[PDB]
Amino acid sequence: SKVTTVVATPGQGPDRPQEVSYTDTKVIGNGSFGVVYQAKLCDSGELVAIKKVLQDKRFKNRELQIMRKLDHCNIVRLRYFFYSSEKKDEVYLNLVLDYVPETVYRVARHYSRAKQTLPVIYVKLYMYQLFRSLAYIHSFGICHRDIKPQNLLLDPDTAVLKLCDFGSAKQLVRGEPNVSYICSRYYRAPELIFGATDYTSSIDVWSAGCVLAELLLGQPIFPGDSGVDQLVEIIKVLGTPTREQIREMNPNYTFFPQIKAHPWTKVFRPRTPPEAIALCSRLLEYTPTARLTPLEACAHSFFDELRDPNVKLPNGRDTPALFNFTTQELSSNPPLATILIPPHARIQ
């Protein structure tokens, strides 16, 4: 019906302002993040999400900066941003971004409502693309600081997963301190609950750990209404941290209920693939530097089936691009290439 038309700056690429018209402007969601719209680009008829948020004239926008720095097959792409005008006499920043139909959250709640669970394949596929996105933003030393099921968008038909909502990501700098009160309750890592401030990008690795667990498990692995509740669940599985391990998370704790390290194998449903639990235990480690790196985790047995050249989706379609590893991603440790890129994908 009514068609809107703006002048916007393209996301990556040089300020060459463009006319952008769109229509069919359903609200998707809204809250802390901002307000998110579905929208249909006039031209192509393509669907896009638009994230309208408040802009402080004082500062430049942190998410925006990041987003423009970022181009990756598993991260929603900013396409245009642009300013505009709920709250009169003040200015809105609008990110026009890829739109994706489902979210890992929705999807796993669907399976859970139905007491069933996710074909393991569909997990691997997702977990892997997630580790790719982490591997890649981490190579700018950027940290999402909010990996949760709700922030992982799925294309159900193509199985493409895209990491999204960077309203929270920050480029971590060594010896600079950052707020410990980020990240979503359940996916907070030990050191965060222990209120640390010198945490590294490896908190993303812990969150992903809980995402994997939660998909394997039907339900969040470290639930808790309070920090303590969570710690107990974490302890009940890892076992009591040690003085050594606690110095690792947060020194200023060098205040503890003495429990034995419960065998992982008894935490997961019975026919849970062994390789998967192996993965988990190497992601969810008390010691931040002991956890796998995103890239080390991509290159792990649990993902071995993704490298089989025969691998297809249940709907018999092809798996998305899995091995097109820009030098950038590989940057954190390039010898891993040999594994990440299976013989059959180095063929002429």
Which residues are annotated binding-site positions for ATP?
28-36, 51
**Can you spell out the DSSP letters for 244-299?**
HHHHHH-STT----------GGGTS-TT--HHHHHHHHHHS-SSTTTSPPHHHHHT
Indicate the SS3 state at residue 35.
Answer: strand
* 83-142 residues near a second copy, rule: CB under 8 A: none
Closest CB to a second copy among residues 204, 329: 204
What the block records as the tokens of 335 is 């010898």
Contact in structure between 48 and 39 (CB atoms under 8 Å): yes
Residues 199 and 178: their CA atoms lie apart, in Å, by: 8
Answer for which of 141, 177, 263, 334 binds a second copy (CB under 8 A) is 177
Contact in structure between 298 and 128 (CB atoms under 8 Å): yes
Answer for which of 168, 202, 207, 293 binds a second copy (CB under 8 A) is 168
Q: To the nearest whole angstrom, how small is the minimum distance from the Cβ of residue 75 to a second copy?
A: 20
What the block records as the tokens of 227 is 């920090």
Q: Among 18-26, 50-58, 114-122, 131-139, which window interacts with a second copy (CB under 8 A)?
A: 50-58
Closest CB to a second copy among residues 228, 321: 228
> ∠ at Cα 72 (293, 46), nearest 5°?
145
Closest CB to a second copy among residues 232, 339: 232
Answer for which of 5, 85, 197, 338 binds a second copy (CB under 8 A) is 197
Answer for which of 14, 15, 26, 32 binds a second copy (CB under 8 A) is 32
- Strands 161-163 and 152-154 come out as antiparallel
Residues 140 and 51: their CA atoms lie apart, in Å, by: 23
Number of residues that bind a second copy (CB under 8 A): 36
Answer for which of 73, 232, 313, 341 binds a second copy (CB under 8 A) is 232
Tell me if 258 contacts a second copy by CB under 8 A: yes
Tell me if 56 contacts a second copy by CB under 8 A: yes
Residues 304 and 314: their CA atoms lie apart, in Å, by: 17
Active site residue 146: yes
Catalytic residue among 24, 146, 157, 229: 146
Tell me if 321 contacts a second copy by CB under 8 A: no
Tell me if 195 contacts a second copy by CB under 8 A: yes
Q: Among 39-47, 111-119, 177-185, 308-316, which window interacts with a second copy (CB under 8 A)?
A: 177-185
Answer for which of 23, 178, 200, 331 binds a second copy (CB under 8 A) is 178
What are residue 333's DSSP bridge partners?
A: none
Closest by CA position to 103, among listed 144, 145, 155: 155
The label of the residue with tokens 């010896």 reads 175
Q: To the nearest whole angstrom, how small is the minimum distance from the Cβ of residue 184 to a second copy?
A: 5
Closest CB to a second copy among residues 232, 267: 232
Tell me if 146 contacts a second copy by CB under 8 A: yes
**Contacts of the segment 188-191: beta carbons below 8 A, 24+ positions apart:** 188/227, 188/230, 189/288, 190/231, 190/234, 190/241, 190/249, 190/286, 191/248, 191/249, 191/250, 191/288
- Strands 170-171 and 142-143 come out as antiparallel
* 199-228 residues near a second copy, rule: CB under 8 A: 224-228
Closest by CA position to 243, among listed 234, 233, 252: 252
Tell me if 147 contacts a second copy by CB under 8 A: no
Residues that bind a second copy (CB under 8 A): 31-32, 54, 56, 58, 146, 148, 168, 177-185, 193-195, 197, 224-233, 252-253, 255, 257-258
Q: Which residues are catalytic?
A: 146
